[PDB]
Design a binder for this molecule. Structure first.
Ligand SMILES: [Ca+2]
Ligand SMILES: [Ca+2]
Ligand SMILES: [Ca+2]
Length: 290
DNA sequence: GTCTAAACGTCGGTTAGGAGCATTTG
DNA sequence: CAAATGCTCCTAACCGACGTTTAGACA
């Protein structure tokens, strides 16, 4: 069984809050307004969604070109809210959530059927995710975007949150470099990684303090948390994710990752035929895993 | 001269986010 | 019959996952 913080952490990575405002002629406002909450994963990670439903006791799972669990009902969205209020987000999506929560209560109270409540909802959508389209902009000119809370001073609520957040945005891979300076031909190192936009770089920084290791890398928008020191990986990272489990197919990737780590710890990455075995593990991992 | 750690670099798709018709409900 | 909800298609970037070079401690 999963942990609630694991769900929150994963949701901080892969979930989404939405407000759909489309034109409906058969409505008295001329507009339809509906709130959504959805998580979209690759087909191979359906069981993640399933484990979430078993905990929350709500949601609709579907599998086509991708796997989704959606909450589009009032009863369903209440379950989502009751969970995220007891176990709050700490990324920038918390801002997206609070705006979502407010719009939710406007709809539960039928206030969205008034034009005043309608306009108010669009002020919330304007500050939600990507904001308003050009079509909605022309339909609702000079709409004042609601104030968006800037999430700062976010401290780690639980170790399970990290396990969840890494199970979504994280990555366990090995690096094989072509370095002639090494005897066995190549250089081998295990790498732990978390990727995120710079808008939550403050969260990435105090994530290092919580894990007591790692470096921050800025690409050529996005920000990465990288761990390469085998000392940290062997004693700090692996025991952490052994207590705080990784969910999904990624778990199978973490196990092979850990299996490679110990091969490096015993210097089998310096023998050419122990290296070939390490490589044989790699192509069965991640993008190679069929 | 070995090998580690980390800085630097790059592809492509699984994510995040979206809009709207079709069906049920009360 | 109108509001809520179920259901189905659409879009691309912030991701995941892969590579090479450089600044050094061991010697
Ligand atoms: Ca994310
Ligand atoms: Ca993911
Ligand atoms: Ca992601």
């Amino acid at each position: 069984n999963i942990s609630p913080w694991t769900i929150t952490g994963f949701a901080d990575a892969e979930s989404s809050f939405m407000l759909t405002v489309s034109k409906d002629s058969k409505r008295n406002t001329g507009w339809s307004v509906r709130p959504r909450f959805r998580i979209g994963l690759h087909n191979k990670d359906v069981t993640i969604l399933k484990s979430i439903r078993e905990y929350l006791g709500a949601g609709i799972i579907t599998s086509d070109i991708d796997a989704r669990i959606r909450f589009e009902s009032l009863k369903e969205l209440e379950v989502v809210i009751n969970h995220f209020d007891k176990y709050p987000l700490i990324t920038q999506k918390r801002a997206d959530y609070l705006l979502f929560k407010k719009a939710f209560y406007l709809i539960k109270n039928k206030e969205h059927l008034t034009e005043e409540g309608l306009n108010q909802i669009l002020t919330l959508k304007a500050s939600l995710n990507l904001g308003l389209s050009e079509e909605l902009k022309e339909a609702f000119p000079n709409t004042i975007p609601a104030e968006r809370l800037l999430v700062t001073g976010q401290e780690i609520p639980d170790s399970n949150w990290v396990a969840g957040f890494t199970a979504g945005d994280g990555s366990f891979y090995i690096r094989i470099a072509k370095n002639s300076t090494l005897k066995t031909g190549y250089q081998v190192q295990s790498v732990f990684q978390i990727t995120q936009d710079t808008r939550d770089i403050e969260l990435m920084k105090n994530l290092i303090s919580y894990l007591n290791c790692g470096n921050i890398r800025i690409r050529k928008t996005c920000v990465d948390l990288v761990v390469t020191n085998l000392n940290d990986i062997k004693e700090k990272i692996i025991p952490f994710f052994n207590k705080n489990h990784i969910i999904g197919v990624k778990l199978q990737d973490y196990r092979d990752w850990c299996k490679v780590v110990t091969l490096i710890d015993n210097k089998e990455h310096l023998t050419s035929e122990g290296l070939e075995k390490i490589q044989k593990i790699k192509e069965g991992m991640n993008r190679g895993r069929s």
